[PDB]
Write a protein that binds this DNA or RNA. Structure first.
Ligand SMILES: Nc1ncnc2c1ncn2[C@H]1CC[C@@H](COP(=O)(O)OP(=O)(O)OP(=O)(O)O)O1
Ligand code: SF4
Ligand SMILES: [Mg+2]
Lengths: 1140, 261, 258, 259
DNA sequence: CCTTCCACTTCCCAACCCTCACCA
DNA sequence: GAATTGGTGAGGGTTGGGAAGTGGAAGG
């Protein structure tokens, strides 16, 4: 032990030296100071007994640039539960058993929502245990856990212990949850000497934020031609970085052929980008100079793009090669998870934000794409192989590139990441490293632990996964799931506001609407707008124009009209469904618990019962057959963990090994004894939701919804003020206003992200508050709503696309559209309403509205008020100019989730699911699709529309049939190649066949395991003709060989084309033109020709044939010999049914 | 009870193997006069009629008339168990939940028995015009089978024309044209090979071969088939089953729309 | 060195395809007594024994024991190339990792010669014990093959029952039940054509029919088949190969869920 | 006008059943000497050659030489309608777009009469080389078919070795290696089993079994197959049709440069 | 000797299982 | 110590059953 205790003292001292070097001078002296909390860490401090005690160090910054630390000691603790009357005996044994190991133990009443009959007010005494250090907790829990484990399976004083809670919450998070200490707030702190703990208290009065010094850096290295760099071989050429808007550049004259002059780079006037330059003779001087300039400026946040992957490991290794221990000079060290962290500063990585909250496609996670998308400028590019020649031939261009990556990194970090992350830090207990790195379900869990603590709830233990659970009918389940969101593409082809389109309608549906027009408007004003109906003068007029237009429609239900294209969808559907129904992860109950609740009384209104669809998949073997296969393993024996170790019997295996062996045996047995290894089963279930249970979850969701809309409004107000201040030109007021604008915009984004998180968390594996039912009930209620909106629209008009929460439809030109009300109150003098909205909304309000909401009005008397609510409201987007949907190549199928939509200005409004966005799909498809979508806008009739659209699809077939004859040779390699990813290691896939695996092996043969070794390899290939009749996967050839040396190409192609006599080694010979033309034929059919046959126009593309089934149907339509039915030629005698 | 025994199970096997493709479920009407089945395909273009007479069975009992529904593919499955030489017995009763079958070899070396599950059906009933037909032709069934297969390779629709000199089948498609022709047998080598045409007046009609393909599966029942045709009404093909009965398919023609105009 | 010659060369072809699909790979044991083989179903529910005799070969040299691993697909793809009338020679060595097969045409105008790789297997074995089978049946092979095929259309499990005077096969499923009865006869024409059942006490047992549909692949080895049964004991199917050997399949009876 | 009557109507079926795998669309030519077709296969690996002399038909009229572009899958499907006993007759007119095929039942019981649409084609062709080969081998066709199927089972490609006393085939691949030898017959009792070899100089050569395994589709066409082989020149595989004609495949030897 | 039935092999199409990336 | 959900398209490979053709032996 003592060696470890001294090692802990050593590291505590070293870290205190390291952060002292960066000016985080520890507070040790009487006085009072104030500052902004930027970071925290857990550490032990030496006390007056010269003992280590566990503590937390808080790091503050001040407006003058000064900084300090405070060390706050707090005892870690957790709870144990015991049987009736055990507490004094168990506590006395806990103390004597571990005397001197535990600091304090005490009896604490807490409320657990899982207790029976708890709504009356019943709560139970847990025992708290607390320790001088977490190491004694980690020891003692391992002395308790076997006893509670055995009693949990079955059900000395350890046997009297029944359960243990909260033992795995992180200690620092346990402190920020408890002391309400939170990051990005101004604090006043009072130091009283070690005679008292240091006291921290927030000031709400100040809202301005300081500017903590942020350093962003990027590097460029030499590498071997056509291959990856590695730190043993290569050297850094340049490092470029910015501190707080000032740029700096270092260049190594071992490699860079000339000294670099200082220069200025500005993509757009907002990005200042002045760069100062230091020339160094040696790599060791480049490193030393950078370490010196970092030790001078002493930054508090350090940023780079994806730094844990390359930029830190390379500069670390090249520093250590010269003996510069960067862990000593800078302080940055690789943590256990392989991520660089430091005591004195925070490592923020932009890509861990882009990958999590930017909503960019994976197509554009490359820095130059994410910069081009969010910053609105195109950065500068180099071929990654040329950098080593450019560093000799034209150094200025390499410097310009490496500076441009620094500028883009710094501004991308400042504008998008920094407001967001510190705003989210204001509401979560976690450090800015953990908040950025962790997954959103964890953020939501910490937030719920904050709220559960404030409610004085005791947390549940994390859910533990069961293996191979049994269906009641006896089959072992492979999987369980709930049925998700409904989808159907109802229509296909082209819709436009400018072409005649044919409608047929049900006049009884018009009569039904016209009968209720008054109710639809009276509701749509009072509930949705919240304007009393008395306050408006023209209400009786507008109803007559609505009724008369509906009557004029009713008189002629079938007509040709121009369409109105509308999108009709629900705002924040799933949160609103939760708030409306009062769903909570703990509120699901069964008859067995409602049997105990004293509120279970005749006519008790609180049991709400809702339907969801369970789904399972299971293996067809029976209960006894599986049990026999389990017995058959009683004689099996298995390898050790290491080649010389003892062989293990089946009962000596881990339960994860056991389950995998059993699944292998049963999967082989079922494949022998039956053709089919699995069966799907679907089952309607009804679940009872308690309506009185503690609301802390639902009230949390409510609070985040409301505060989101409050900050959205304040952002609108301040953005107006900002526009006015800019037009007037008051630069100090402009700065004040812009600061408030960015503060509210980041706060509202952070609340939107947190609100989105609450649904999926309840399904996360091992979440504390976990239940599958609440996610099913939400998905099914969101499938009902959208289905009934489809049904109601399908009589009036033609719904086109339907997904989880919104419908795309066309409506007749004569429809009501929007109306205006004039208000007597000047506070809201005019109001507008949209009829399709109120029409759908009243349908929602009639069926879905809850009438069982209950709220505890008097905590002393257990009296609950009973209330109704609906929070679900539709809203309208559009009307749009044009809409286009593709059609399936197979007969009668319809392609879901694919469409394009345009604004009235002809700017592309939406374009969804198409290969133009996807990462990897063939570039020829991207360009073809993009150009045809634009081409559809042209023309005025379906004949002219397709006459336009045809030529853009003809152009690419003309090029391919011409073998791109005139196209430059460098163009084909970008036009013709995929860039597909490979997510796993090449060994981990197993024995599978695929084109990416094939071409990775085809690289391994050519440059060795050095190139495959890392995960995430990118594979660029073309598919080749010469191995005639060889299956597709075997004809995939890397692009790299067309860059490799001639004598290597003329060898490896001769090997891979299985053609030793081959004289011609040119892509234009090698290309399988009839594969790529079949790919384009597969695309062009789905958009331009098959939809055409579905819209009564002849084939617009002569070169492409229809599918055979469609040619049969179109040939059968048109001949003159019509098929009669037998029932029309022979007399029908009657109808009969046969039954026993 | 209903009880029947058949001199050779190959007949009922060949019947079920001919019904299996065209009508998936059907009901049988049973009486002391015999067994009747009539049903209509899932597209109402063609109609099947089957009649087995009381006398053809080796022994027959029918205490009361019965009607029962049968999923024909499952019966064809069970009847795949019986050997070609086997003797087969059917038994049923008015509780009508199940049909019992017994199959045995002529030497009683082995016994096989089964209980087919019956099913519930609803179906519409049609009448028949019972006219005389302006042309009738009697044909070797193997020749009509080959005519259908070969011309079906040329195209999806057949034209049938009957004229004093000889019957003609014609078809055409994207490949070109095909014509197949038969004539009056002047000297009969054997009657089973003879073709005979008798007519009131010549006839021309057109039909979908996708259905005839399903009728010609009757060819292994009997060596000769009857074709009957008349203007603007269904074509008849008819196969006779020994002295026991007959199986008939009616096919509604394709008619020229221009008169409809 | 091991070397052997077989004039009835088609036997090895017929005997191999009866295993090719039931067991993926096997360890053969070679000794002066003859080639012997225990191997187990990949699902380990069922077991194979093959046993030839060295007296039956046209020539047989075995001066030492060998154990050799082979995956039977690899032999099968070679024996496909032998004509049924041709004479087979096998050659192996104690240090070698390959096997040589020579096919000799009776006309002596054609010869063929193949070498295949062994595989490196070892297998842990319990010697299969004798049982005093309470029930034994001898039947013509095609009858049993037809029973197992025709019942396979009804359903995936067969209840086989036996009596002092016959046997019954029965199956129950979604199409309805079906049975086949085979009574014992005293009158018999010939052994290739006749049944002989003997039973000490009544037994009936349930067996997976999709397994028997594998065992029936041995049918062309013999004009008759032997089956034996007892309660709580595996069923054994046995084929005799001239007097050159025998092949047996062992299968456990189904545990009833009731 | 052109017309021809073929009483041996099966041979035209078996020819189309042979060609349809190697070439999908081809142009026939017709002359006073008879019918010719020579064409590269679709992959341009190997060359197919066929001719039928006009002396083979029951009668033949050909007023001018002509060429007819035809789809072999279509003509194969049409000819599958003729019975093997039936007479075939072909006719066309020099300005017609269509070929007329008549099938007559021998007993005159029946007639059938089909037309197929022509298409317009032109194709590149050269005078076929022939010379004295170093090796010639004659064999029962079924034996060569079994040899090809077995070696294609074991291996990718066959190497053929030649001697005065016999001929040997060998292959190797993932399953192992295999060797097959046929010796010259000592004396012949019935001809078709007799293997006979002509041998001027030793030859050993390698060929791709995919194409021999197509070429063997002509096995139903005659009971005796012939092979002609020499160093550094295409293998010729030859089948002789009735009296009237012949079918040849030309396939270049596999190069083994990598050594 | 000629014709029919049964057995075995080959050819062709449909359905299921794998990857990755995008719609909610 | 770690850990959001379900649904769809596109491209590719593997598995199983039915239809068609050929060879033998069996029957008249
Ligand atoms: N990342 C994700 N994780 C889990 N569920 C998700 C999800 N993204 C979408 N869903 C599911 C659950 C929610 C649902 C989308 O419907 P709403 O109306 O609730 O979302 P929205 O359209 O963004 O809100 P609005 O802009 O109208 O305010 O899709
Ligand atoms: S839902 Fe009602 S009856 Fe059930 S536990 Fe809650 S309060 Fe009691
Ligand atoms: Mg929404």
């Amino acid at each position: 032990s003592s060696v470890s205790a001294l090692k802990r003292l050593e590291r505590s001292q070293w870290t205190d030296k390291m952060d002292l070097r960066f000016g985080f001078e520890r507070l040790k002296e009487p006085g009072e100071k104030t500052g902004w909390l930027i970071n925290m860490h857990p550490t032990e401090i030496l006390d007056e007994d010269k003992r280590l005690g566990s503590a937390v160090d808080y790091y503050f910054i001040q407006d003058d640039g000064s900084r300090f630390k405070v060390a706050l000691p707090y005892k870690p603790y957790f709870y144990i539960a015991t049987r009736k009357g055990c507490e004094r005996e168990v506590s006395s044994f806990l103390s004597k058993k571990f005397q001197g190991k535990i600091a304090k133990v005490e009896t604490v009443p807490k409320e657990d929502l899982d207790l029976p009959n708890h709504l009356v007010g019943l709560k139970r005494n847990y025992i708290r245990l607390s320790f001088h250090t977490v190491e004694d907790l980690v020891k003692v829990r391992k002395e308790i856990s076997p006893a509670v484990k055995k009693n949990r399976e079955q059900d000395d004083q350890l046997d009297n212990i029944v359960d243990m809670r909260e033992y795995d919450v992180p200690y620092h998070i346990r402190l920020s949850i408890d002391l309400k200490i939170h990051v990005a707030h101004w604090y006043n702190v009072r130091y009283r000497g070690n005679a008292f703990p240091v006291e921290i208290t927030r000031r709400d009065d100040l809202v301005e934020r300081p500017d903590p010094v942020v350093l962003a850096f990027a590097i460029a290295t030499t590498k071997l031609p056509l291959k990856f760099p590695d730190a043993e071989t290569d050297q850094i050429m340049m490092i470029s970085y910015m501190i707080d808007g000032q740029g700096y550049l270092i260049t190594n004259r071992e490699i860079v052929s000339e000294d670099i002059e200082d220069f200025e780079f500005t993509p757009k006037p907002e990005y200042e980008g002045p760069f100062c330059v230091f020339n160094e003779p040696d790599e060791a001087h480049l490193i030393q100079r950078w370490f010196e300039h970092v030790q001078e400026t002493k930054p508090t946040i350090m940023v780079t793009y994806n730094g844990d992957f390359f930029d830190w490991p390379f500069v670390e290794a090249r520093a250590a090669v010269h003996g510069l221990s960067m862990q000593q000079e800078i302080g940055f060290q690789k943590d256990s998870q392989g991520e660089y962290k430091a005591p004195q500063c925070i490592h923020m990585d932009c890509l861990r934000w882009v990958k999590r909250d930017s909503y960019l496609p994976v197509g554009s996670h490359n820095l130059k794409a994410a910069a081009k998308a969010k910053l609105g400028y195109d950065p500068v590019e180099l071929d990654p192989e040329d950098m080593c020649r450019m560093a000799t031939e034209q150094p200025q261009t390499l410097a310009t590139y490496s500076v441009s990556d620094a500028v883009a990194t710094y501004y991308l970090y400042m504008k998008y990441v920094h407001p967001f992350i510190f705003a989210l830090c204001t509401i979560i207990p976690m450090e800015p490293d953990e908040v950025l790195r962790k997954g959103s379900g964890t953020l939501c869990e910490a937030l719920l632990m904050v709220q559960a603590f404030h409610a004085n709830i005791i947390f549940p233990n994390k859910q533990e996964q069961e293996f191979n659970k049994l269906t009641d009918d006896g089959h072992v389940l492979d999987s369980e799931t709930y049925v998700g969101g409904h989808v159907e593409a109802l229509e296909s082809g082209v819709f436009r506001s400018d072409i005649p389109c044919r409608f047929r309608m049900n006049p009884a549906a018009f009569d039904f609407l016209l009968q209720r027009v008054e109710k639809t408007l009276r509701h749509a004003l009072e509930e949705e707008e919240k304007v009393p109906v008395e306050q408006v003068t023209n209400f009786e007029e507008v109803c007559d124009e609505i009724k008369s237009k509906l009557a004029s429609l009713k008189d002629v239900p079938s007509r040709i009209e121009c369409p109105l294209i509308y999108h009709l969808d629900v705002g924040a559907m799933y949160p609103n469904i939760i708030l409306t129904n009062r769903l909570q992860p703990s509120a699901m109950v069964d008859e067995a618990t409602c049997a105990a609740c004293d509120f279970n009384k005749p006519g008790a209104n609180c049991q709400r019962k809702m339907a969801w669809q369970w789904r399972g998949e299971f293996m067809p073997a029976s209960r006894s057959e599986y049990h026999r296969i389990q017995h058959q393993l009683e004689s099996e024996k298995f390898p050790p963990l290491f080649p010389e170790g003892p062989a293990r019997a089946f009962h000596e295996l881990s339960r994860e090994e056991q389950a995998k062996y059993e699944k292998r045996r049963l999967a082989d047995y079922c494949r022998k004894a039956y053709k089919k290894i699995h069966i799907t089963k679907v089952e309607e279930r009804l679940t009872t939701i308690c309506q009185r249970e503690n609301s802390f979850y639902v009230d949390t969701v409510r609070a985040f919804r409301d505060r989101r809309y409050e900050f959205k409004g304040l952002h609108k107000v301040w953005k107006k003020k900002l526009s006015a201040a800019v037009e007037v030109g008051d630069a100090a007021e402009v700065k004040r206003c812009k600061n408030m604008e960015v503060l509210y915009d980041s706060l509202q984004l952070a609340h939107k992200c947190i609100l989105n998180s609450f649904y999926g968390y309840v399904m996360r594996k091992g979440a504390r508050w976990y239940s599958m039912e609440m996610a099913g009930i939400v998905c099914f209620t969101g499938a009902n709503i959208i289905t009934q909106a489809r049904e109601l629209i399908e009589q009036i008009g033609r719904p086109l696309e339907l997904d989880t929460d919104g419908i795309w439809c066309v409506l007749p030109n004569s429809f009501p559209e929007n109306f205006v009300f004039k208000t007597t109150n000047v506070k809201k003098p005019k109001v507008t309403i949209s009829y399709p909205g109120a029409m759908l909304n009243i349908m929602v309000k009639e069926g879905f509205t809850n009438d069982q909401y209950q709220e505890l009005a008097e905590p002393s008397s257990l009296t609950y008020v009973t209330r109704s609510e609906n929070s679900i409201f539709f809203e309208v987007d559009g009307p749009y100019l044009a809409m286009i949907l593709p059609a399936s190549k197979e007969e009668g199928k319809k392609l879901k989730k694919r469409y394009a939509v345009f604004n009235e200005d002809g700017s592309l409004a939406e374009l969804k699911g198409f290969e133009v966005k996807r990462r990897g799909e063939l570039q020829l498809i991207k360009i073809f699709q993009s150009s045809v979508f634009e081409a559809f806008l042209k023309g005025s009739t379906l004949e002219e529309v397709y006459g336009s659209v045809a030529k853009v699809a003809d152009y690419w077939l003309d090029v391919l049939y011409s073998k791109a004859a005139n196209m430059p040779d460098s163009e084909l390699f970008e036009l013709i190649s995929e860039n597909r990813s490979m997510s796993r290691k090449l060994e981990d896939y197993g024995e599978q066949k695929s084109t990416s695996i094939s071409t990775a092996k085809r690289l391994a043969e050519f440059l060795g395991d050095q190139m495959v070794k890392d995960a995430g390899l990118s594979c660029r290939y073309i598919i080749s003709r010469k191995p005639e009749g060889s299956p597709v996967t075997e004809r995939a050839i890397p692009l790299a060989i067309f860059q490799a040396e001639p004598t290597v190409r003329k060898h490896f192609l001769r090997k891979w084309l299985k053609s030793s006599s081959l004289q011609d080694f040119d892509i234009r010979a090698i290309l399988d033109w009839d594969y790529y033309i079949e790919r384009l034929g597969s695309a062009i059919q789905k958009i331009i020709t098959i939809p055409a046959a579905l819209q009564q126009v002849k084939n617009p593309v002569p070169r492409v044939k229809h599918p055979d089934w469609l040619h049969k149907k179109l040939l059968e339509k048109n001949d003159v010999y019509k098929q009669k039915k037998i029932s029309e030629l022979f007399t029908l005698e009657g109808r009969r049914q046969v039954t026993m | 009870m209903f009880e029947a025994r058949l001199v050779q199970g190959s007949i009922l096997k060949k019947v079920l193997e001919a019904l299996k493709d065209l009508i998936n479920e059907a009901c049988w009407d049973i009486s002391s006069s015999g067994v009747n089945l009539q049903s209509m395909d899932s597209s109402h273009v063609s109609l099947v009629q089957l009649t087995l007479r009381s006398e053809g069975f080796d022994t027959y009992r029918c205490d009361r008339n019965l009607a029962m529904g049968v999923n024909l593919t499952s019966m064809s499955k069970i009847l795949k168990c019986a050997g070609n030489e086997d003797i087969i017995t059917l038994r049923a009763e008015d509780n009508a939940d199940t049909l019992a079958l017994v199959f045995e070899a002529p030497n009683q070396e082995k016994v096989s028995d089964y209980e087919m599950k019956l099913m519930d059906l609803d179906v519409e009933q049609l009448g028949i015009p019972e006219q005389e037909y302006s042309c009738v032709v009697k044909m070797p069934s193997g020749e009509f089978a080959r005519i259908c297969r070969d011309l079906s390779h040329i195209g999806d629709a057949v034209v049938i024309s009957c004229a004093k000199d000889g019957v003609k089948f014609s078809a055409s498609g994207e490949l070109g044209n095909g014509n197949i022709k038969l004539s009056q047998t002047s000297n009969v080598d054997k009657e089973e090979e003879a073709v005979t045409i008798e007519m009131n007046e010549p006839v021309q009609l057109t039909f979908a071969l996708r259905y005839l393909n399903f009728f010609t599966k009757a060819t292994p029942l009997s060596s000769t088939v009857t074709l009957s045709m008349s203007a603007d009404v269904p074509l008849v093909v008819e196969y006779k089953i020994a002295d026991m009965g007959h199986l008939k398919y009616y096919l509604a023609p394709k008619i020229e729309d221009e008169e409809g105009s």
